[PDB]
Design a protein around this ligand. Structure first.
Ligand SMILES: Cc1csc2c(Nc3cn(C)cn3)nc(N[C@@H](C)c3ncc(F)cn3)nc12
Length: 274
């Protein structure tokens, strides 16, 4: 990929831009998503190459396709036109029923189950990091915080998304498949809230902790709440069997948390019985 053939179309949200890769200047070229670093440091760059290597190594239906690179390093990916699942849910909620939410849920599990075989830990599972390809397919769209497990350990030690974090991630900075399972439970909760603003994991947890709590105190109070089995409530209209999956993902006992395999099967069964 050559920088002079990447035509700027728009800012998507380092930074992510929508470009046209048109080498033979005529607009026939394909529209791609381009990720680049804003405040490019030696440390920020070294993790970005690991992210590029992680994406290149991934070949799955529910994982955003790697296309190539561009050198001032730029990661070139396929363009998914409906944006993040977080935005798509807010926008088209009217055409999204519980069967559709479970179809998305299932796809997220399948993509996560695949990451697991590569011994990769996502660390940032949230609806904002899930992209919509079309009305029937979603993909994990960002791998910026993804880590590779040490060959001999089942975990890894590292601004963080605290309201999606497992207790051991908050207390010990320990990231594993089980902490990705914990976050999947938050993703499932987000889906069944349909991203109703007041019902988001930060909004709910803050109410439970006290909206008076500030900065450094919030984390300790969140750690305490989770330890005293305080949990996100059941979203309105959320089927009890779906809430039981969430609560099982939110087990304080890391080893008692379900596998992405079992989760996809359970979600697929509920979906069929619906
Ligand atoms: C409004 C909108 C419409 S399409 C789209 C999009 N598409 C995209 C991003 N990538 C990496 C591939 N296609 N990415 C983004 N934003 C970027 C930051 C993005 N990248 C990855 C992700 F998981 C979620 N969002 N917004 C939109």
């Amino acid at each position: 990929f050559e920088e002079r053939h990447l035509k700027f179309l728009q800012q998507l949200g380092g930074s992510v831009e929508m470009c046209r890769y048109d080498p033979l200047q005529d607009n026939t070229g394909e529209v791609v998503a381009v990720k680049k670093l804003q405040h490019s440091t030696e440390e920020h760059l070294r993790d970005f190459e690991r992210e590029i290597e992680i994406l290149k190594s991934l070949q799955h239906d529910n994982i955003v396709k790697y296309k190539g690179v561009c050198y001032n390093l730029k990661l070139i990916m396929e363009y998914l036109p409906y944006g993040s699942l977080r935005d798509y849910l807010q926008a088209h909620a009217e055409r999204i029923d519980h069967i559709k939410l479970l179809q998305y849920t299932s796809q997220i599990c399948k993509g996560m189950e695949y990451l697991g075989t590569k011994r990769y830990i996502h660390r940032d599972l949230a609806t904002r990091n899930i992209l919509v390809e079309n009305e029937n397919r979603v993909k994990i769209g960002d791998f910026g915080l993804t880590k590779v497990l040490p060959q001999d350990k089942e975990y890894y030690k590292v601004e963080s998304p605290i309201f999606w974090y497992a207790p051991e991630s908050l207390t010990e900075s320990k990231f594993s498949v089980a902490s990705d399972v914990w976050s999947f439970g938050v993703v499932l909760y987000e889906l069944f809230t349909y991203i109703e603003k007041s019902k988001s994991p930060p909004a709910e947890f803050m109410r439970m902790i006290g909206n008076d709590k500030q900065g450094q105190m919030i984390v300790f109070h969140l750690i305490e709440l989770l330890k005293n089995n305080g949990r996100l409530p059941r979203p309105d209209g959320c089927p009890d069997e779906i809430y039981m999956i969430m609560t099982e993902c939110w087990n304080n006992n890391v080893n008692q948390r379900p596998s992405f395999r079992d989760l996809a099967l359970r979600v697929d069964q509920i979906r069929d019985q619906m």
